[PDB]
Amino acid sequence: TTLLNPYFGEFGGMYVPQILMPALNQLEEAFVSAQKDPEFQAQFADLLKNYAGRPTALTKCQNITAGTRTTLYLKREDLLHGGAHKTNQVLGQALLAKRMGKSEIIAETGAGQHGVASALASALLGLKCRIYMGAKDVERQSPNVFRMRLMGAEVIPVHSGSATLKDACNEALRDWPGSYETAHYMLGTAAGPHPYPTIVREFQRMIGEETKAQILDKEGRLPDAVIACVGGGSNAIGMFADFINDTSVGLIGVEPGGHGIETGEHGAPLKHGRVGIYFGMKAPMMQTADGQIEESYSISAGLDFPSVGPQHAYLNSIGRADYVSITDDEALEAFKTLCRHEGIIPALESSHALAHALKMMREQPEKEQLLVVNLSGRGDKDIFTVHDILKARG
Amino acid sequence: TTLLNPYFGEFGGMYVPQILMPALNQLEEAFVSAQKDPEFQAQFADLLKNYAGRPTALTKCQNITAGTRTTLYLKREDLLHGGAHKTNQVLGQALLAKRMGKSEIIAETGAGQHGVASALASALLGLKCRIYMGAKDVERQSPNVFRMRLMGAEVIPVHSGSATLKDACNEALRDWPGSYETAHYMLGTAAGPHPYPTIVREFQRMIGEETKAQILDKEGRLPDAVIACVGGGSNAIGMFADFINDTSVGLIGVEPGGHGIETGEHGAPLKHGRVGIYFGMKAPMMQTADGQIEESYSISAGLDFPSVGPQHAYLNSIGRADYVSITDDEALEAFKTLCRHEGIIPALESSHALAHALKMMREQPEKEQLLVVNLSGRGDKDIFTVHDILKARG
Amino acid sequence: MERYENLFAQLNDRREGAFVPFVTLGDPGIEQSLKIIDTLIDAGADALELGVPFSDPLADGPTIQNANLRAFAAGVTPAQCFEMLALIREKHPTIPIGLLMYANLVFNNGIDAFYARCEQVGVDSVLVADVPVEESAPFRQAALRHNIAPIFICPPNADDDLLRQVASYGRGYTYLLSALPLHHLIEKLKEYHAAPALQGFGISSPEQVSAAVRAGAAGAISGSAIVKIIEKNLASPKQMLAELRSFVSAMKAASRA
Amino acid sequence: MERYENLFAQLNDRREGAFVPFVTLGDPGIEQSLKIIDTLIDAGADALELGVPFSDPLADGPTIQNANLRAFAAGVTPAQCFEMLALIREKHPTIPIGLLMYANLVFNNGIDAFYARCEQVGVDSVLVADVPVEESAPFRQAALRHNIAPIFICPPNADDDLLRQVASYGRGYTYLLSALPLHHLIEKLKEYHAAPALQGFGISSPEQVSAAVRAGAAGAISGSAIVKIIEKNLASPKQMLAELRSFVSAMKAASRA
């Protein structure tokens, strides 16, 4: 029995062992109550203004579009404190954790971005944070590791299964049933069991609402299409939400194509996997004929989740958003374009979102179109990876 | 003959070879004209809103001050695009470079921050950028190097003298007299020959003016003291400027003490060096009994300039600001405090500014005082250095 | 369903609790796994509980995570697991055989078909570790239609709604997971005419089997414990078989009283 | 000041331009530097221009940057440089001796004292490479008071204001740096009764010495060129001294006409 819907058409639900049910239901009731709570809403509004740096600017990119009929703006969540949009919803899941009387945070991370995020919000808000990271992600992300320990979090490496992000998500779900009376499980994407897809959307939704007002004021009309990358779905559903009811606006989500869809080495389950139930939910997954779950592959760490948020599978099924894919190459080009033309170094995640907007302009250069790309983080974390590639080739 | 004063009491002036005079004078007239030019002022206001992300929030740090009578706020120039205040004045020196019809930018850099900055503004504004970096700074700052090349700048390593920041500043001044008709020399601190101390102040001054309005609105009165670190002087004079005429406000500049003033291994010429003329100007320098100029030493790359902005020597001489020093240790502590208590990883430069504010509170914990520290950049660039230290000790 | 009504009736005539051990199929390989499971039976297991290796077992502790990896290192897949379930039922026609599944393994190629294939090879129950009662409608309906009992966990702090649900929806046995007094959960599951309770998790010495009978349950299930014995004697299969026969013989003699 | 009025008078009687070579004092070491400079003189240099090594020579090209580093590698300091200036003047009482200084070396322990010490040891001019005319008041006043001529660079695009200033403030010679026609800068510096012009930078073959005389200057200064000869023959001091004597003999024979 739940207060809100757990499903978006067929996809969603709460597929967890019975002993996790009361933690979900208790979360869901905390969240319903906070959303009508005007005090809670002012407390979260004040953290995101004064601490994390909202609103985030909308930058026009005139140099990249010259000699076409594309107007391109970049919503800049790379300027938010900790350098990616992941900060918006950790502040809000930590504030919910306080409202339930909790003192402790559980988190899962892959490349380490969400690990950080949840370590900085737990440091600011006086929570004791422990995080699970697959050992493979441990060893290749020693920068992130050290930052979470600076910020007082305890970091636990998970050696099971494939020892990456999903084996992390698995160890999260195993600890929480022993601890949910003082510990809040701070999931880092718009996916997993209900209520987590709804809550992450609504604590990311100001991406969209400030984009609408900032385009209305600069161009006096709405975008022809908003564009975002899709690893689990949160920055994209945060961009799209407030535009789902303005049916002339385009919603485009971009998945990682890796080496290419045909090699099978990609992260694009939404258009290229099959409906399964895993991590709590019924959604598209990367899995065998047989049903074992696989890893995604992307040059971008942050998009490597072999499933996707259920609200994204739903808005694909009814044709209100469209989903496509960009290859490791494509995204490396769009990363070099933005550094040399606009002096903005984007995250390899967001570079796929921009790669598709550059093909939208390059394919049809005299189509008049107003395009916003959500540039979901910066890309300092990625310059060794791109130098090592470029070096390997010359 | 000049339009504005070149001196702040005894310090300042234009001590350059005669053949650089016309480039200075031409700069100074371009700048006078732009400052009354309402169009120029709207163009710069729009880059700093939409591109670089102004205004920068003012964060209250309640966790660090608990159980004392200190209220501490952090002006957050770490949230400005490229991660340090250096971005404010490159946008404005590049806009001046355009107003003179120039197409080319010369820059000097040490640790690589100002190198970046001037590469991103030259990429955005369609200038061709070449930068000089001492080879010693080259080799230890390969991250920065690669970023400037991403962003299309040409980078030249200088092997002369000590092959660090000052031998860079020397090669800048050698190329410009052959090129100042199409090339603007984009100096990266509030120091060098007139007009560069005045121009860098006035393109950094919005640090201060938004701090005043943001404290007035949050606390209804002005700060008892504003606090900033002092490597050449620009972020500090940008914080202080608009408060020099509110004589109850404290201006405190903090120099690097290195290993300690007594070891002689420091960067604190303002209180511990002697008046000399070097890089264009008459100001305090780190020099021998004999007059050769030396390097500063700081764990922080960014503060290692063995001289200081002349306007800082002037406001020290008349007692309107005070200057002090913080040791490599002191600043490493204040960097670990802010990461664990507020979930903000500060630059090792800004950590000295915070180190002195923490001693202001810790020394007298029941003094009622409202303190703003200008947190001039973030500190991701510095986590390998701090992990390597902490590791060397255990 | 039937084999388990037969076995509880038979055990009630003798005033005996059931002892049910759990193993992962194909650990440490398909041939070894078959000899482990004929050993558990000859030693006196009353029923088996048997898991199919799943790449992401979010409900299992470490001992069982490692049993999965071992089966995967030998190449075991769901198909070989249904192959092994047929040979085990051809040799042992009356023992109740229950599977512990994850949801995606059942939902993979159609939930009806999966409960049909269990009916074919002769399985009697399936408990889906990540399907709570609130999501269980299709899986219970389908299991019902193929004469397979859907098993539910009843956690130790179950409120009355849940007790009522678990008693109404389950068959075969109620999996009674070891705040809330035993004696209450047990009485209430009888009152609502639930399938007989088996207590499980943490069950690893004879005295806990006697205790769970005395508290009113019908028997107990042991798995981490059996799985460790395998993990410990991998290098000597013959000694593995000896320690398993000893442990199981002791546990099932404790149910006699 | 006097030695340079004497030498230009003497050279005017003979219808000859002056040839002035530049060297860094103490390069490549103090003893070698002394023998380089007695060689330049015996070969026919009319005047010397002599630089004191400064840690940051922002007005010098690469050849002279490397001459500084070499003097620093031998340990040369301003004090040893004033020691060497005394021995050079004790041997050669009439040659005009001008220094090329940086501002901090003069301002270091008081600008008056520095021009006093030049007066003591017998120097006749100092050109401060980073002091433009607009900053030059104290340095010219002080130099004047100690009977030392302050030398100014007159750049090739000098406007009329600057010409007027350079002619009024300088003494000894005007350093005429090689848009704007020669023939104009030269006539104007005579018109405003400036110190006689010496053309310098880029002067590295005999024919440019003849040309600068014909254009109306009083002579020419060569330094990068002399400095390279040192840089090239470091390993053979005797050959260094031979090539320097040859080059200087050629340049000064071109001033004869």
Ligand SMILES: O=C(O)CNC(=O)Cc1c[nH]c2ccccc12
């Ligand atoms: O491990 C035990 O002692 C008992 N375990 C079982 O009965 C089998 C089991 C493996 N994984 C599970 C998840 C939920 C319920 C039972 C299991």
Ligand SMILES: O=C(O)CNC(=O)Cc1c[nH]c2ccccc12
């Ligand atoms: O290098 C030359 O050919 C001439 N150089 C000089 O006359 C001496 C000199 C060294 N550095 C300078 C800076 C300004 C003016 C002269 C010099």
Ligand SMILES: *Cc1c(COP(=O)(O)O)cnc(C)c1O
């Ligand atoms: C983690 C991350 C992503 C991917 O997650 P979403 O939940 O799909 O939004 C995208 N961009 C950045 C910068 C990230 O750090």
Ligand SMILES: *Cc1c(COP(=O)(O)O)cnc(C)c1O
């Ligand atoms: C370069 C830098 C400084 C030092 O220069 P100032 O001109 O003295 O302000 C201080 N903080 C940061 C973050 C820097 O990047």
Ligand code: NA
């Ligand atoms: Na995905």
Ligand code: NA
């Ligand atoms: Na300094």
